[PDB]
Amino acid sequence: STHFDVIVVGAGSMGMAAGYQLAKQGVKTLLVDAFDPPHTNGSHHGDTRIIRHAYGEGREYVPLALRSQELWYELEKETHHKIFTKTGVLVFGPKGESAFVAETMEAAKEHSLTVDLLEGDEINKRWPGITVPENYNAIFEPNSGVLFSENCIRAYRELAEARGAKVLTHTRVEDFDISPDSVKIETANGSYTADKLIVSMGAWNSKLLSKLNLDIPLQPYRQVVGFFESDESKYSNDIDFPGFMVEVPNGIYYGFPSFGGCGLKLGYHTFGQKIDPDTINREFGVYPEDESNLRAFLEEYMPGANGELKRGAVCMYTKTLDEHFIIDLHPEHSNVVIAAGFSGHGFKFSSGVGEVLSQLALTGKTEHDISIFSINRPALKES
Ligand SMILES: *Cc1cc2c(cc1C)nc1c(=O)[nH]c(=O)nc-1n2C[C@H](O)[C@H](O)[C@H](O)COP(=O)(O)OP(=O)(O)OC[C@H]1O[C@@H](n2cnc3c(N)ncnc32)[C@H](O)[C@@H]1O
Ligand SMILES: [Cl-]
Numbered sequence: 531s532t533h534f535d536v537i538v539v540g541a542g543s544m545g546m547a548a549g550y551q552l553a554k555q556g557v558k559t560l561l562v563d564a565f566d567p568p569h570t571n572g573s574h575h576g577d578t579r580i581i582r583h584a585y586g587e588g589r590e591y592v593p594l595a596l597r598s599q600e601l602w603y604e605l606e607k608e609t610h611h612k613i614f615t616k617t618g619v620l621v622f623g624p625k626g627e628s629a630f631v632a633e634t635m636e637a638a639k640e641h642s643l644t645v646d647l648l649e650g651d652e653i654n655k656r657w658p659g660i661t662v663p664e665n666y667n668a669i670f671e672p673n674s675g676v677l678f679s680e681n682c683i684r685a686y687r688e689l690a691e692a693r694g695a696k697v698l699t700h701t702r703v704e705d706f707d708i709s710p711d712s713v714k715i716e717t718a719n720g721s722y723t724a725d726k727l728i729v730s731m732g733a734w735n736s737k738l739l740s741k742l743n744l745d746i747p748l749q750p751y752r753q754v755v756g757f758f759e760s761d762e763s764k765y766s767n768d769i770d771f772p773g774f775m776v777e778v779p780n781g782i783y784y785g786f787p788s789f790g791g792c793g794l795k796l797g798y799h800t801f802g803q804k805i806d807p808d809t810i811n812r813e814f815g816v817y818p819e820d821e822s823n824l825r826a827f828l829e830e831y832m833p834g835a836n837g838e839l840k841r842g843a844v845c846m847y848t849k850t851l852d853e854h855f856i857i858d859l860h861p862e863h864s865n866v867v868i869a870a871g872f873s874g875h876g877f878k879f880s881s882g883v884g885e886v887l888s889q890l891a892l893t894g895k896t897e898h899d900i901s902i903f904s905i906n907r908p909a910l911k912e913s
């Protein structure tokens with residue numbers, strides 16, 4: 531077993547980023563993961579992830595989004611792994627009927643973000659492959675884009691390990707023992723202690739936070755994505771087809787241009803199966819909704835991308851009641867940091883969250899404004 535300065539439980543999107551930030555500073559860190567990140571059992575696989583700046587979930591996310599983007603460019607320069615591609619991100623929906631589109635526009639105004647505003651046929655004309663009604667409007671963000679999530683984690687890990695961070699893989703943490711001046715974790719592979727603890731177990735936060743005497747409503751969701759054979763002359767990243775997140779009458783959908791002919795990737799954001807991370811069925815197609823919900827969108831808005839299903843993936847969201855993250859110190863233990871409930875839209879922020887967690891762990895404070903992610907906020911229902 532062993533003592534460390536800081537122990538990160540759950541070395542995924544947020545945990546690995548935090549580990550890199552801590553290692554960068556010579557802090558002796560131990561990262562423990564139930565698997566070997568990047569892997570396919572958590573919430574970070576599927577190759578790609580969208581990063582937006584003009585934020586429809588709330589203009590208050592923009593600062594963290596912009597910091598995260600600069601950190602993603604810094605990472606790109608530090609590793610041989612591909613990190614980011616500037617595909618741009620298109621957001622559209624029925625004019626005057628999408629709160630999501632409206633807040634994106636408002637967020638762009640408020641932070642002076644570079645965006646293109648277009649409507650109806652202008653959308654169809656600019657991007658062959660997209661067919662929306664004339665009453666639809668859109669906001670395009672040219673400088674945001676796509677992150678290669680597994681590469682990001684792969685890179686952060688290599689860099690952190692090179693700096694002395696230790697990563698104990700295939701080791702599930704089973705319990706916590708917190709004291710006024712130190713922390714302790716129990717695993718089948720042994721116990722470990724440290725001065726500070728960062729808890730970032732993803733979907734498992736919903737099951738294991740009780741071990742830290744925390745009772746926070748968190749619901750894991752089974753969320754699938756599909757890769758479809760597409761008309762490359764319209765949907766390839768090479769011809770500038772963008773990443774997208776749109777709101778139509780029956781929900782919100784997000785997708786990616788085809789990269790090297792992998793096909794257009796699509797996901798249905800507002801619907802998923804309520805599940806438990808330990809019993810979830812990770813095979814794509816076991817629910818008729820998996821493929822049908824995707825094709826229903828494609829046949830209507832992007833017909834040339836409604837070809838054979840090339841690959842399907844199953845992944846998880848961990849939602850809070852207000853769908854805002856939880857990044858804060860444990861209410862009763864200043865030496866414990868919690869990172870949870872990223873509600874299906876937290877990867878783009880993982881670089882910035884890594885920095886935030888590092889600062890909270892080492893100082894109990896952060897230069898970032900994270901009040902909207904407070905663990906004590908009412909809309910969370912925390913006890
Ligand atoms: C699922 C999903 C999510 C998603 C997305 C598409 C899909 C299908 N597209 C996104 C996008 O385009 N843009 C964006 O910003 N986010 C998007 N997301 C959401 C994002 O992927 C998630 O918010 C993010 O991955 C959350 O990160 P977090 O770090 O919370 O989760 P993780 O990466 O799964 O890491 C948790 C790790 O902890 C380990 N673990 C679990 N239990 C234990 C125990 N007991 N002991 C030790 N380790 C444990 C896991 O193994 C995992 O590695
Ligand atoms: Cl995915």
Ligand SMILES: [Cl-]
Pocket residue numbers: 573846847848849871872873874875876
């Ligand atoms: Cl999530």
